[PDB]
Design a protein around this nucleic acid. Structure first.
Ligand SMILES: C[C@@H]1CCO[C@H]2Cn3cc(C(=O)NCc4ccc(F)cc4F)c(=O)c(O)c3C(=O)N12
Ligand SMILES: C[C@@H]1CCO[C@H]2Cn3cc(C(=O)NCc4ccc(F)cc4F)c(=O)c(O)c3C(=O)N12
Ligand SMILES: [Mg+2]
Ligand SMILES: [Mg+2]
Ligand SMILES: [Mg+2]
Ligand SMILES: [Mg+2]
Ligand SMILES: [Zn+2]
Ligand SMILES: [Zn+2]
Lengths: 261, 61, 47, 261, 61, 47, 239, 239
DNA sequence: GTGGAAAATCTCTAGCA
DNA sequence: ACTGCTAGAGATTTTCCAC
DNA sequence: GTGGAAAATCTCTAGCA
DNA sequence: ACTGCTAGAGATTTTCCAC
């Protein structure tokens, strides 16, 4: 089929046929047809069919600016719990966002904020506010809203709730606060059948308690485990398995072929 | 002594995701929590989940 | 070595080939004529 | 929990809590909480998460108008096979669409055309053209592009192909015809590993041949089958099952409890 | 006589979909074709698919 | 009898309740104050 | 199984239900009933609001008295609408159930009453004064670092809530409030469970006994201030 | 298994491979080889283009000579560009491999040559005239129903292609062309299969035998004009 | 009966605008 | 009484080929 | 061991603009 | 070197309760 390769190359240069067509009409093996297609710069027009996963650490907040009735609503969400805070701000400015961020950092332990590349989030004012409060700034890939999916989703949810309570307030700020209240303490579901406020309290309390307990355990329990290497610190044992860390590489080994001193 | 604290840490529940599956895995059992990774036990299987893919809660159920 | 063809910023036209500098879960850092870009894997194809 | 019902009704009238929250905070059974939620007009804000299925009969074509480089491209797709015909028309007028439809009906057996509610498709001229050619017109639900998914998808595909061959022509009409050629006879895949032209020929030929053969079988084979009912005309038998048609209701019954005279 | 025609009709292949599943089912075996419904056999199972959900082709493989 | 709440024509506001006249696969015909509408089931909720 | 040891421990030391449940591995309902069975064993959502003045500007301060957690905001004027907006913001962030106020005109406005009614808050008319003094001290400390007073106030709130530690355990106000709210959530879940099971009567025929726990293969009940366990097969539960 | 009966049938009657494959349930490759084994036994993509005139307008007509299927279009003028555009449209709709033209200036333009080269069509310079007369008759019949001549031409094409029946089987031009193209597709698939298998050599040692069919549990081969069947275990196939 | 490898099937996403 | 789909990029399950 | 029923888990989609 | 997600509407699988 070697002459078929040249025939198919000309056919593709003309028509840009996919590998199935070339294989069928020139008796090419699928590998050769796929190679012919993959050598054409004009036929590389589709990306991987997958989705990434955003960070869900206890200390990461996702912020965004949504618009409603000509007003600007700045919305922050705790990624690990779904807990939201929203404020109607007079304009999409760096000063307003820095004030919102300082308020947020004064109430909850904000360690990193993830945001789009909007001008307010990229301003030196927000940079100074984050530096003072010790917050790490993450920016998503430009024009990739999926990177902020969580907060984006919440926008939807927030607006929905406003649509249900807008008739109970004279102004949009009051309706926004009502929606925040309803989302945080009147909508139950998720990982633990929790509300958002209950879930965030559980997340933070669990972080503190686990840190404290693990600190005490590591203070008390001291062993070195060899397996198969170097002085690999013991981490956990039981159920016929030993989890250890070596050169800061956590691994799990069977209880056998493992000795603990 | 050490055992009470180990059991207390063991009481926490962990919801996690794998590197390609977008659905959250059920309430695993915590065994170790580190700065970067958490060692959990899900259905007699030990796993080492990155900290960014874990939600640790003591469900008040 | 790899060839990366990508669609970066609200531009339907695909570009490439580019050199793959770093591959991660969900995004790839590539170099396209002395220009470094970070592209989600949904908008990149690696050969 | 009977007093809980009134408490939860007031709580929902205020905050519009979901059934989980009401059940948790008022000890209501899930049925009663769901009933409370379902009685609130303001909480009916989501439809069922399902997609319908478009018609895929051999005689149904889906037509649409797409735009490219300031030009109007009228595209028709044979739903069963994916075979497309595209023409650059001077304007989105009823006369141009009627001419396109008469041309299409003169080449292939068009029995039904499914289109959006665009002005050209709803014009009396297209109605007259379809009446003369004996074509029935189906219009999707307004502002529901999914009803025309097939043709919509093809638009994408068509444009994609044009992007690969636009440099090979000095006009958009030539590029459109090149793209139609490439899609119909240079892209292979789908149900039979076919190309679109081969698939449409197979579909039409199979329709004709099966009609002819079934006519012969029915004229030859005459039987009446009683099962369990009335004089149900026999349809097929074998493999321990009999398929029959009683009162124009096709059904399958076991070979047992079925007698054929 | 009649059996040759029945076998010819049975040679055709049918791809079909169910009322909720969006994925096309494999190449079933045609048994009857009507104006409104097609009776097919897919894995020793007889089904009556509406005509609008069927693609009947004699695969030239 | 049923209650149908629907979103008809590029109008994010939901409407209803309405009387269900006919239910099919992927669409439902409903009556809302002497007005007949055909709505895909993705944009309708039936109780 | 281990109920008798827990009961004896309670009789000796009068311990609380958390301690008994942790020590003797009992479901919390059983420990709560053990505590309530003795006749001699018989706040998280309370906030205190005040409005101070600094540099001729009004600073509305809310203190979680149980923990010392602070929320301060510089408001334009001492107006009822603005106090209501601040209260709604506070209620949407933390589980506020009661608020104490100094009978000021803004705190008694009909707008604030409406806001509290909507948020389900009850109003009652020296933690707050000491906290105001501390907040003013921190504001004075950080005022060199902020051009405006609102930014300085927010910085002071942040420093007080998270960068100041003290007390018996050396904790900050944020950790203390999170722990207190978590304990409140645990208490409310336990109360919900008790309410759920208090409307059952179990026969094990032995008289109508209250139900304390329905396990996988056991039923723990109480009869005449005596806690017993019976097999699921031997027990019959009705409403 | 049924190969010998098919071979004898071909010897007596010299039937084609479709008939033998249908009658004796052989794979088409075996029947094709049986036909090609005898010495005594040794169009679907051909179109005819012309340009007629009617009411002082140019009507370009393409006829599928094998079936009589017509495609007519009123073009602005007898120009090379218009003919090339019509040819590209035709090639994108039906599998055109060859076109016969009347040496007209438009048909010999460099634009038409480029269009045919791109579409992979070979150009060669009384079916067409008779079809033109029939088309003109139908146009005359339907001209009362169309304000313009292009609409009348398209109506005439529709009537001729689908509403006229005749011939041995009483079929329309559309059915005939669909059948002819389907037969062409079958022939090309068979040729692809033969090309795929023609580069194998099978030993069953017996000399190098050509491969005709690789079944699930059999291998049908040909050696010195004798067709035989072997089990897969006894046969060794190489490229 | 069984590894490697090639082929078939399954899963999933952008764009249609 | 009408109705999401198509085609490509990986990934996973299946089958085939020699040992 | 087993039907009904209620509860838990799984599947899927719109909007975020 | 960074990354779709959330919550509601049905549907389907699981478990519980008496017989
Ligand atoms: C003026 C006519 C008549 C009234 O409706 C408008 C608007 N419209 C909109 C889309 C559109 O939204 N395409 C994107 C898309 C989104 C989802 C999906 F499933 C399929 C899709 F194609 C069309 O394709 C389209 O043809 C029209 C159109 O023609 N009209
Ligand atoms: C001017 C800033 C900076 C530069 O980017 C723009 C445009 N933009 C666009 C969307 C948007 O497309 N939302 C719809 C959506 C689509 C898919 C998905 F996964 C999530 C989604 F939210 C935003 O949400 C958004 O915040 C912005 C924005 O802020 N900006
Ligand atoms: Mg934004
Ligand atoms: Mg946004
Ligand atoms: Mg349209
Ligand atoms: Mg369209
Ligand atoms: Zn190409
Ligand atoms: Zn409601």
């Amino acid at each position: 089929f070697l002459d078929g390769i040249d025939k198919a190359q000309e056919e593709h240069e003309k028509y840009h046929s996919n590998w199935r067509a070339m294989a069928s009409d020139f008796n090419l093996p699928p590998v050769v047809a796929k190679e012919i297609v993959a050598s054409c710069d004009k036929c590389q027009l589709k990306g991987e069919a997958m989705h990434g996963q955003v960070d869900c650490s206890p200390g990461i907040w996702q912020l965004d600016c949504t618009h409603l009735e000509g007003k600007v609503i700045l919305v922050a969400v705790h990624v690990a719990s779904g807990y939201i805070e929203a404020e109607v701000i007079p304009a999409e400015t760096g000063q307003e966002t820095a004030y919102f961020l300082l308020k947020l950092a004064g109430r909850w332990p904000v360690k990193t904020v993830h945001t789009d590349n909007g001008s307010n989030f990229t301003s030196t004012t927000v940079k100074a506010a984050c530096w003072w409060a010790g917050i790490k700034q993450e920016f998503g890939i430009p024009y990739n809203p999926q990177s902020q999916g969580v907060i984006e989703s919440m926008n939807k949810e927030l607006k929905k709730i406003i649509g249900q309570v807008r008739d109970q307030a004279e102004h949009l700020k009051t309706a926004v606060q009502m929606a925040v209240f309803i989302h945080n303490f009147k909508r139950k579901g998720g990982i633990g059948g929790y509300s958002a406020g209950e879930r965030i309290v559980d997340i933070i309390a669990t972080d503190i308690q686990t840190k404290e307990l693990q600190k005490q355990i590591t203070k008390i329990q001291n062993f070195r485990v060899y397996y198969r290497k170097g002085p690999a610190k013991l981490l956990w044992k039981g159920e016929g398995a030993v989890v250890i860390q070596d050169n800061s590489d956590i691994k799990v080994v069977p209880r056998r072929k493992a000795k603990i001193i | 002594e050490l055992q009470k604290q180990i059991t207390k840490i063991q009481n926490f529940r962990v919801y996690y995701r794998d590197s390609r599956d977008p659905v959250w895995k059920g309430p695993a059992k915590l065994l170790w929590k580190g700065e970067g990774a958490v060692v959990i036990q899900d259905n007699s299987d030990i796993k080492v989940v990155p900290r960014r893919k874990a939600k640790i809660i003591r469900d008040y159920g | 070595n790899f060839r990366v063809y990508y669609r970066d910023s609200r531009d339907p036209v695909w570009k490439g080939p580019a050199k793959l500098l770093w591959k991660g879960e969900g995004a790839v850092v590539i170099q396209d004529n002395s220009d470094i870009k970070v592209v989600p894997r949904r908008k990149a194809k690696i050969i």
